[PDB]
Amino acid sequence: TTGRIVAVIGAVVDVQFDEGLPPILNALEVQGRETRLVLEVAQHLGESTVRTIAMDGTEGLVRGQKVLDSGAPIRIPVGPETLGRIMNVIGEPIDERGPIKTKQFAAIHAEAPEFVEMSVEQEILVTGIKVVDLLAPYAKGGKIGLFGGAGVGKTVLIMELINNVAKAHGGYSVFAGVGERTREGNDLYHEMIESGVINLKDATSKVALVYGQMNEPPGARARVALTGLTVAEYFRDQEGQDVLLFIDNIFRFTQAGSEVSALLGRIPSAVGYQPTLATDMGTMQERITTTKKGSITSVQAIYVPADDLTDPAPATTFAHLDATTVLSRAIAELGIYPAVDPLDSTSRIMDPNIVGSEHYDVARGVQKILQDYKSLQDIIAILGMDELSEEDKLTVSRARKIQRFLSQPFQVAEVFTGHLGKLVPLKETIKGFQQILAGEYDHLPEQAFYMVGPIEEAVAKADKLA
Amino acid sequence: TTGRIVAVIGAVVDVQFDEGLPPILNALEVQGRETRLVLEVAQHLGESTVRTIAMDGTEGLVRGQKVLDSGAPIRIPVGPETLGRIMNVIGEPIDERGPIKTKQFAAIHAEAPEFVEMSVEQEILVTGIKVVDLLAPYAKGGKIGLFGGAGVGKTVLIMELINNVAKAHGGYSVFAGVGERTREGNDLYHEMIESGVINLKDATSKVALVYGQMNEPPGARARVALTGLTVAEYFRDQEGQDVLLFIDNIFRFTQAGSEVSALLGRIPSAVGYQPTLATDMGTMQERITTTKKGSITSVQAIYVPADDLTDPAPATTFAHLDATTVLSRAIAELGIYPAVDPLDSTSRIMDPNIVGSEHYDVARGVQKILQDYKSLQDIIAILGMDELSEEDKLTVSRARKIQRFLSQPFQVAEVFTGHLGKLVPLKETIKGFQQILAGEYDHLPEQAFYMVGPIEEAVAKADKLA
Amino acid sequence: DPAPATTFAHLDATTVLSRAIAELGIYPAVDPLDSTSRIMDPNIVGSEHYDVARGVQKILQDYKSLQDIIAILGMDELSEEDKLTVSRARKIQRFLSQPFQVAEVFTGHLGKLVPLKETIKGFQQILAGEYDHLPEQAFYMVGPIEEAVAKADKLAE
Amino acid sequence: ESTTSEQSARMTAMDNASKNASEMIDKLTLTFNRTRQAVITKELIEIISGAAAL
Amino acid sequence: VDLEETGRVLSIGDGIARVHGLRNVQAEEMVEFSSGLKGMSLNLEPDNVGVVVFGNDKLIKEGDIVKRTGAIVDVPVGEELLGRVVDALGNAIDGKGPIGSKARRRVGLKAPGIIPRISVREPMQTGIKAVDSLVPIGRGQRELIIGDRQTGKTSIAIDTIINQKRFNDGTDEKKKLYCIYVAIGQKRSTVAQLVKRLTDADAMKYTIVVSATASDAAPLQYLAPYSGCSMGEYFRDNGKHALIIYDDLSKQAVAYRQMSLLLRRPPGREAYPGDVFYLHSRLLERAAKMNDAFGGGSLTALPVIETQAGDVSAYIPTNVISITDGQIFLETELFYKGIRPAINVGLSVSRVGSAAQTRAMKQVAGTMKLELAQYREVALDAATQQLLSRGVRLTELLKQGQYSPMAIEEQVAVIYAGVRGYLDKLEPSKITKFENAFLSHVISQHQALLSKIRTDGKISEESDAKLKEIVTNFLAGFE
Amino acid sequence: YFRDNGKHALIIYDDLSKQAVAYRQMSLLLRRPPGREAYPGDVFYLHSRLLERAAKMNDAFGGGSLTALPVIETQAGDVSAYIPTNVISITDGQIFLETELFYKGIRPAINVGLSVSRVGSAAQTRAM
Amino acid sequence: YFRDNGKHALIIYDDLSKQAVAYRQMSLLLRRPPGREAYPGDVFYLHSRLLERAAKMNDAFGGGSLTALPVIETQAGDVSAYIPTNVISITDGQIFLETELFYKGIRPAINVGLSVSRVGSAAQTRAM
Ligand SMILES: Nc1ncnc2c1ncn2[C@@H]1O[C@H](COP(=O)(O)OP(=O)(O)NP(=O)(O)O)[C@@H](O)[C@H]1O
Ligand SMILES: Nc1ncnc2c1ncn2[C@@H]1O[C@H](COP(=O)(O)OP(=O)(O)NP(=O)(O)O)[C@@H](O)[C@H]1O
Ligand SMILES: Oc1cc(O)cc(/C=C/c2ccc(O)c(O)c2)c1
Ligand SMILES: [Mg+2]
Ligand SMILES: [Mg+2]
């Protein structure tokens, strides 16, 4: 049935319906427009009038302009035909390759899996990336904060994560560009094409892209996360996969929701965030999890406003994270790729009761030896390296040798370098550093461990050095 | 005559009367209830409707429900048989010992004693607490205020004062538990039975109890002070006697005030508070006073929200007091109890012509060395002890010995301190700080001054340290 | 503050006065690291005026960032060229002060008007080092550089 | 013997001065943001109260 | 037709349903939406009812029918709720079929007044050495658990719950303790894991779990603790003992702020409403110890509060410290260094627990408190080095893993070792090792004495002298 | 009255902080929208018109005068806050007192740098 | 016009603080809801739809471009203020200037450690 626009105030549009009213969250199709104008029902004002938030510009709308209730929330195309495609928030293709032809559509608003639908187990999601698995491992269905910002291997890491999860776990990936910069969305898409993870020729693609560009209205940027989230929910729910979901970036999901809140006339809360800060976050996050059928794991890029970890935005966010990958510029400048800081990057599942007594002890030794290597670098500057005790001479060698073994070549960059990448199995990771700590490779040259896969390829690199 | 409820929202109920509109402050009796539900008329909304505040829960109230004007404001028992009893905000017995059968009743709302009714006499009240009696001594018939953040020692200090001042005072006492703990009421009540200042079978009771704790709704907490107060007025006026009044905690009255002000539909003032904060408190505080007709010595605990003494509640409270005792979290966390700030507590009898030049000189000396030391603490926090001139080191050593000797074990706090409680005569307090200022104990180590009574005990603890 | 902040742009020259500076007795309490002029440019006031001015701000700003630092870390640790820029800036600050004709009731001092060239020359000379031997307080609340020198003798006894 | 003890002690004093300073950096950083958050919130409640009173 | 028992929805969307009609509704009465959702009458206005929605108000439309239920908001209550996971309304969420519940209790009942109470006096044994000895708790007390995220807060609650099995499998009925874990704001997966943990420990058979998670609507999150609390009161008022965990109240206050700002309540300090204190105060007042004339029952409340950067001075932290009877404070710095449970002793208090600590613990505990008080003060002469020697070692004794809570007699034997100097000669990195070797030795060989200590609630002069032998014999043979 | 009849008077307002609190109360209950720090937008004017009425009249108008000493309470030594600066911006000077000075022994606790008189030596005898 | 017809333009917006202020005026007077700093919820949108229109077009579309140098005034170097937050977030890099560097004789007063360009080496000749 069909209602009439009665009020247009910026990106807020009020529509009046003569008969049956569209429930909250329903998607409204505005008529007489060259492109699609979706209005999400936000409120019921009384007197048969709904308050809506526009998903695109409202320039041109006239009082009385017909509006068709679609009868559902925003429904977007889902299934394998989305892989390699870029869609927008309402499910349209924006890569100009034509319709996304799927046999299913799905609503972007879904309630979280019920208490019973939850996996009571805590599993590691093996990434194949040594630093991560050993020290800050991903929980299957957990959330991970990604710190770093620019020029730190952020795109390469993402692209390798996609690749490694397709290979080792047979799951696909989704990328949700929340406040994606048009320019950077062009670059990332091509970077993905060139690394293989998107393939435009056949159907071997591993990521699906959903872009909520910065020049779109508040309601659009607030919802893109959900759009991508549902694309991911298909793979977990219909196909039984363990899926990767990238959210870039989670701070702009908050802000977008803050702006929506502000347009709806609501009272701001502490520091000018929406009062529904925690719930807005909660209803999106809880969908990310392990069900009995499959799991969605999410890698979320964080911006910390004012460098304040106690700002409501990062505070609220941290409540949902199970691990942090910290990408540091310092480490990159030392030629370690991935630029992962092994001391700053933590995991909630770094607990012997979850990952195993053994996996625990090795990580804590690797952490310890690197901490103790930081303690000596001043005395290294003061007394030189040859005024260390014989036990201390070893800690340095080993530490420096552990530092490099944490580096690793990526498949996603085989094109740029000529070096074959490595997905390293968890047990070989555990073993490599296990054996290093024990001094089973002290005699080997420092440079044998650098940019290598498993520990066998370090002995192989040492034997080749004339 | 008879009125009907037309609106309910938490504590605030609107009532429409067809004839006979009850004046502001009149108490109204809601019909159809199992326990007595009083409404106080707050405003005349117009249209034969009044806005009222409930003295108890409003669950169960229906629109249409009947209300009777009592013809007067809340009236409560007053006189000799309030002694030994616990009553609520509306004078009902709450100790399960039956009717309270007084000859007199009083309205909880009265106007404040007139300007001609003021007394001008200032006489020191020695508490036995070193910090207080020295720097900011209390006065018989005066207004004492105990400021403190959450958990810093407000209630211990008041209980200690009740022990140290009340027992040896041939008059009556009123304790008004206002918005505090119920189990503390239960503690206070049995403690008094155990000590016999309340007798359950005699007529020898010396304290009257009035309680409206943090389980009560806001109206009740907003008025309990008036009840408690009112009982104190009777004893001051209709006997001429020496009355002691302890309130814990008066802040709760303003907070309670804050909770109904939103509902009463006022435009809020600073930090969300009621824009009537100042006058509300003034009309209530001005009643808590010594008059030509009889003396009231009032000791009120004053809670500081968020440790902010610039918050409207406490900030506005300062000007109602004759002596302040400002407690400091930071000081309590250093182990100094009572956690008195020696440079923020003041007293209006700190004057050489009232307390004598000797007392005045030592006090100013104690506070001088403490301020000079406080000025030196930033140079200390970066560069520490060593970088100070020989002179500064002496002001430091002496101040630190002075801070420690300001502390005292309370008989009421023996479980937390591990020391038998001490009470120091005023002379002994003076001579102790005097001697520490003349340098007589420069050779003693600080630790000797911590948690002792008279100076002689510090000496004994020094020798005991060998 | 919205009000003063919105005003700056309507201005060709800004004289900003500071309480911190007034508190020290430096009047007029003009903050030399926050006062500006469109015409403070060599093509306009000439390279001599511009260089001096820029210098005065340089030594003053250098001093400002040494202040909080040597206040705790001690004066003696400084390089002998650094602790000269300390002595010179502290003099230039004082030489920025000046008795006003309309403030005789506030100062006790006689009002003094300094011609442009004499101001440039006076400061040029302090930056040069021509008065490192003169006491700080000699430059305080005087007109032209002469009166600082004269004031130096009256302070010698 | 004098300079051995001097540079020994100075090393220690400056080590402690630096560590104290570092601890003070954090404490002020925490205060800043607690103030930073309150100012913002305060400015906002003033605006809201102003619009709501109309 | 009937606007006395019924209304229709006028407007919806701010989490508040404006409802025309319903002329005979009570304040705070549950109403029932045509879509099955429950609601609460909050605003009884001349021409509408303001109804707080106990679920997703996406499901409510203009024109929907609302019916009175006649009942002030209440929840199912009784023993049949044990071993169950329920949402905030009481409806079962563990899919084990209906709760066979026989009574119901109001969620907003005012806490017991002054007379029916008596000061706490029965130990509430957490099983955590550091807590039970240094920050001891009695049944009826409110003890706050406070700290930054990820500092071990929930852990305190969980081992406590798990500890009670020792009594809950006895026939001593007064010695028992029924638990309720209220999850406000948590991840659902976190809760699901938790009951799995409890089930695994066979603790779930005496626990009620009330869940109001990150994706439940705000009103639900706010209601959960009260729903939890009535369930507890069932035991309090019936001659039984209940422990309740509000995990956590920071999140619940956030829930409430969202409701108040949407209701346009004037924002105060940190945009929190005037009544944010009252929200917690009334709740925790409901934890209580009842005297023998009202059953002798009790409800112990362990609320959780989450600090931002160890700042105990912020609005909500201080409100709750101003309510409860002391606090366990958990430091990020202590937790980091692996000191676990990460208890700051200095800043932790139990205002009322000393009275409900066994004599047996008190005999070793008072001197431990003392020697640890001396050691904090001095973190190369004879005396002040020994307090360092003793101090580090007592600090190692307070360390403890998870899911292994300790019987009281086991705790004291361990602390006995410490406070009687037997640990002084050993190295700090071996105290943990000595503790486990020693504890399991005495459990397998000297049962008679451990039992006697549990039974006597004391260390007798024989027991002490006997425990002097056992330690010397073991320490000389510890390698 | 004294002022306009060739006499001299001295008036103390103890204190105008509390007056402001009372006008803020009155203004908000009259439904006048709050402004900075919840006070009304004309809190300056509240004190400006009061104090401009302290004045020195010339001989033709009688030679009488009225001298004012408003009192303002600060919060934690902040002479620079909104309200304090408002009043400073009305009066012909200020005497700023501080606790630190007070307890250091400097009583009267006048902070010299921050205090002023806008009339200066014209208000002194030649001797002083 | 240049971007689309094969050419290159440079646009300087001077400044955007002031633009936002003009929009804040209209919104508030239109009685739209005020947020942080009384800016409306569409202030980020305002600036983000302007600055996205700067772009490098491909050959298929003429190969032209429009480069934007937006200007933002901070207050006491508060880069975390609402509007600065918006444009920093929006842009591809920032040239930060400081007053202390200015008077240090460092002109132009560019903070070299803080300023960034995420385009980076990609827009330099091999020489530079
Ligand atoms: N006694 C202990 N010994 C060793 N590890 C522990 C102990 N207690 C807790 N942990 C670990 O520390 C982590 C955090 O503990 P938790 O009980 O979740 O604290 P919390 O502050 O309540 N967490 P959150 O509510 O998410 O901020 C968990 O992963 C536990 O494995
Ligand atoms: N004089 C004292 N000596 C030793 N310990 C004290 C003293 N005063 C307070 N404490 C400690 O602090 C705790 C709280 O004391 P209390 O008197 O309740 O302070 P309060 O300010 O009333 N708390 P609250 O009402 O919640 O703000 C006590 O249980 C003691 O452990
Ligand atoms: O510690 C805090 C935190 C906070 O979030 C706010 C405040 C104060 C806010 C305020 C807001 C509006 C006013 O008009 C006012 O006087 C004060 C103090
Ligand atoms: Mg108290
Ligand atoms: Mg927890």
Nearest to F75 among B275, B315, B364 (CB): B315
Is the separation of the CB atoms in A212 and A88 below 8 Å? yes
Note whether F122 contacts C105, CB cutoff 8 Å. Answer: yes
Is the separation of the CB atoms in A320 and A143 below 8 Å? yes
Fold of A74-349: Rossmann fold (3.40.50)
- Angle at which helices E408-419 and E359-376 cross, to 10°: 40
Give backbone dihedrals phi and psi of B253, rounded to 5 degrees, phi first. Answer: -65, -40
Give backbone dihedrals phi and psi of G71, rounded to 5 degrees, phi first. Answer: -110, 135
Q: Does A34 participate in catalysis according to the annotation?
A: no
Is the separation of the CB atoms in B63 and B8 below 8 Å? yes
Of E299, E163, E280, the residue nearest E229 (C-alpha): E299
Q: Is the peptide bond before F108 cis (omega within 30 degrees of 0)?
A: yes
Q: Write the residue with the smallest CA distance to atom 19 of ligand 2.
A: B153
Of B98, B159, B86, the residue nearest B129 (C-alpha): B159
Is the separation of the CB atoms in B89 and B55 below 8 Å? yes
Do E14 and E66 share a domain, yes or no? yes
> Is the CB of residue A352 below 6 angstroms from any atom belonging to ligand 1?
no
- C120: its two tokens: 């440039």
CA distance A440 to A452: 17
Q: How far is the CA of B406 from the centre of ligand 1 (A)?
A: 41
In the three-class reduction of DSSP (H, G, I as helix; E, B as strand; rest coil), residue G116 is classed as strand
One-letter amino acid at A321 equals L
Give backbone dihedrals phi and psi of A351, rounded to 5 degrees, phi first. Answer: -145, 125
Question: Least CA distance to B386: which residue of chain D?
Answer: D13
Contacts of D20 (CB under 8 A, 6+ apart): B381, B382, B384
Q: Is E338 on the interface with A (CB under 8 A)?
A: no
- Write the DSSP assignment of chain F as a string of letters: --GGGT-EEEEEETTHHHHHHHHHHHHHHTT----GGGS-TTHHHHHHHHHHT--B--GGGTS-EEEEEE----STT-TTSHHHHHHHTTSSEE--B-HHHHHHT-SS-B-TTT-EESSGGGGS-S--
Contacts of B382 (CB under 8 A, 6+ apart): C72, D17, D20, D21, D24
Q: What is the CATH number of the domain that holds C134?
A: 1.10.1140.10
Give backbone dihedrals phi and psi of B406, rounded to 5 degrees, phi first. Answer: -80, -25
Is the separation of the CB atoms in E309 and E148 below 8 Å? yes
Cα pseudo-dihedral B398, B401, B406, B412, rounded to 10: 180
Q: Which H/E stretch holds residue A396?
A: helix A390-405
Is the separation of the CB atoms in B134 and B168 below 8 Å? no
Give backbone dihedrals phi and psi of A255, rounded to 5 degrees, phi first. Answer: -60, -40
**Strand B66-69 to strand B12-17: parallel, antiparallel, or no bridges (unpaired)?**
unpaired
Q: Is the peptide bond before B249 cis (omega within 30 degrees of 0)?
A: yes
What is the side-by-side strand order in the sheet with G65-70? G8-13, G65-70, G55-56
- E122: its two tokens: 């029965």
Give backbone dihedrals phi and psi of F29, rounded to 5 degrees, phi first. Answer: -75, -25
CA distance F95 to F97: 6
Q: Give the nearest ligand 2 atom to B158 CA.
A: 17
Give backbone dihedrals phi and psi of B316, rounded to 5 degrees, phi first. Answer: -70, -25
Note whether E214 contacts A320, CB cutoff 8 Å. Answer: yes
**Cα–Cα distances in angstroms (integers) from residue B352 to residues B321, B433, E334, in the given order:** 20, 17, 51
Do E167 and E243 share a domain, yes or no? yes
Q: Which H/E stretch holds residue G24?
A: helix G16-29
Of B15, B6, B128, the residue nearest B67 (C-alpha): B15
Q: Write the residue with the smallest CA distance to atom 27 of ligand 1.
A: E149
Q: What is the CATH number of the domain that holds E469?
A: 1.20.150.20
Do E51 and E112 share a domain, yes or no? no
Helices assigned H by DSSP within B123-267? 130-135, 154-161, 182-195, 218-237, 251-263
Q: Is F80 on the interface with C (CB under 8 A)?
A: yes
Best mutation target, E269, E307, E315, to test chain D (most D CBs within 10 A) = E269
Of B380, B385, B368, the residue nearest B436 (C-alpha): B368
Question: Solved by what technique?
Answer: X-ray
Note whether B416 contacts E349, CB cutoff 8 Å. Answer: yes
- Write the DSSP assignment of A139-193 as a string of letters: BTT-EEEEE--SSSSHHHHHHHHHHHHHHHH---EEEEEEEE-HHHHHHHHHHHH
**Cα–Cα distances in angstroms (integers) from residue C14 to residues A220, C17, C36, C42, E191, in the given order:** 45, 10, 5, 18, 63
CA distance B166 to B158: 11
- C33: its two tokens: 């690291």
**Cα–Cα distances in angstroms (integers) from residue A437 to residues A82, A186, A433, in the given order:** 46, 44, 6
Could you tell me the resolution of this structure in angstroms? 2.7
Q: Is F56 on the interface with B (CB under 8 A)?
A: no
CB atoms closer than 10 angstroms to residue A164: 23
Of E105, E106, E109, E86, the residue nearest E220 (C-alpha): E86
Helices assigned H by DSSP within A406-453? 414-417, 426-437
Best mutation target, G46, G83, G89, G115, to test chain A (most A CBs within 10 A) = G89
- B289: its two tokens: 């006073």
Instruction: Output the 3-class SS for C20-53.
Output: HHHCCCCCCCECCCCCEECCCCHHHHHHHHHHHH
In the three-class reduction of DSSP (H, G, I as helix; E, B as strand; rest coil), residue E375 is classed as helix
In the three-class reduction of DSSP (H, G, I as helix; E, B as strand; rest coil), residue C118 is classed as helix
For E296, left (φ over 0), alpha (ψ -120 to 50), or beta?
A: left
**Strand E207-212 to strand E178-184: parallel, antiparallel, or no bridges (unpaired)?**
parallel
Q: Give the nearest ligand 1 atom to E247 CA.
A: 25
- Helix, strand and coil percent figures for chain D, each rounded to 5: 95, 0, 5
Domain that holds residue C114: 40-157
- E442: its two tokens: 């005495």
Of A298, A308, A258, the residue nearest A278 (C-alpha): A258
In the three-class reduction of DSSP (H, G, I as helix; E, B as strand; rest coil), residue C104 is classed as helix
CA distance B6 to B2: 13
CA distance F57 to F53: 11
CB atoms closer than 10 angstroms to residue G39: 23
**Cα–Cα distances in angstroms (integers) from residue E66 to residues B8, E23, E39, in the given order:** 19, 12, 9
Is the separation of the CB atoms in C123 and C95 below 8 Å? yes
Is the separation of the CB atoms in E116 and E290 below 8 Å? yes
Among E325, E341, E357, where does a domain finish? E357
Do E18 and E94 share a domain, yes or no? no
Closest ligand by atom to E246 CA = 5
Do E375 and E238 share a domain, yes or no? no
Active site residues of F: 118
Contacts of G59 (CB under 8 A, 6+ apart): none
Domain that holds residue E386: 358-479
The full set of domain ranges for chain B reads 1-73, 74-349, 350-466
CA distance B98 to B113: 33
Is the separation of the CB atoms in A270 and E270 below 8 Å? yes
> Is the CB of residue E400 below 6 angstroms from any atom belonging to ligand 1?
yes
Q: Is D24 on the interface with B (CB under 8 A)?
A: yes
Give backbone dihedrals phi and psi of G74, rounded to 5 degrees, phi first. Answer: -85, 165
Closest ligand by atom to E155 CA = 1
Fold of A1-73: Thrombin, subunit H (2.40.10)
Question: Looking at the 3D structure of chain E, how many domains does it have?
Answer: 3
* Chains in touch with A (≥3 Cβ pairs < 8 A): D, E, G
For A353, left (φ over 0), alpha (ψ -120 to 50), or beta?
A: alpha
* Chains in touch with F (≥3 Cβ pairs < 8 A): B, C, D
Vertex E110 angle, CA E104 and E111, to 5°? 100
Helices assigned H by DSSP within B247-388? 251-263, 277-285, 312-317, 329-332, 352-355, 357-375, 377-383
- F10: its two tokens: 């001295």
DSSP classification of residue E38: E
**Cα–Cα distances in angstroms (integers) from residue B175 to residues B128, B291, B297, in the given order:** 21, 20, 12
> Is the CB of residue A348 below 6 angstroms from any atom belonging to ligand 1?
yes
- F72: its two tokens: 């303002």
CA distance C81 to B454: 58
Of A360, A432, A356, the residue nearest A398 (C-alpha): A432
Among E339, E357, E375, where does a domain finish? E357
Q: Going by beta carbons, is chain D in contact with chain G, meaning 3 or more pairs sit under 8 Å apart?
A: yes
Do E51 and E197 share a domain, yes or no? no
- G94: its two tokens: 């920032």
- E231: its two tokens: 């369930």
In the three-class reduction of DSSP (H, G, I as helix; E, B as strand; rest coil), residue E273 is classed as coil
Fold of A350-466: 1.10.1140
**Cα–Cα distances in angstroms (integers) from residue B418 to residues B24, E367, E392, in the given order:** 54, 10, 22
User: Tokens 């029952």 correspond to what residue?
Assistant: E297
CA distance B80 to B205: 9
- Helix, strand and coil percent figures for chain E, each rounded to 5: 40, 20, 35
Overall residue count recorded for chain C in this entry: 157
Residue ranges of E strands in G61-107: 65-70, 93-94
CB atoms closer than 10 angstroms to residue E139: 26
Our measurement of the distance from residue E82's CA atom to the centroid of its chain's CA atoms, rounded to an integer in Å, reads: 17
Of B77, B75, B107, B73, the residue nearest B95 (C-alpha): B77
User: Tokens 């068709």 correspond to what residue?
Assistant: A68
Q: Is the peptide bond before E56 cis (omega within 30 degrees of 0)?
A: no
CA distance E303 to E244: 8
Our measurement of the distance from residue A347's CA atom to the centroid of its chain's CA atoms, rounded to an integer in Å, reads: 15
CA distance F110 to F99: 10
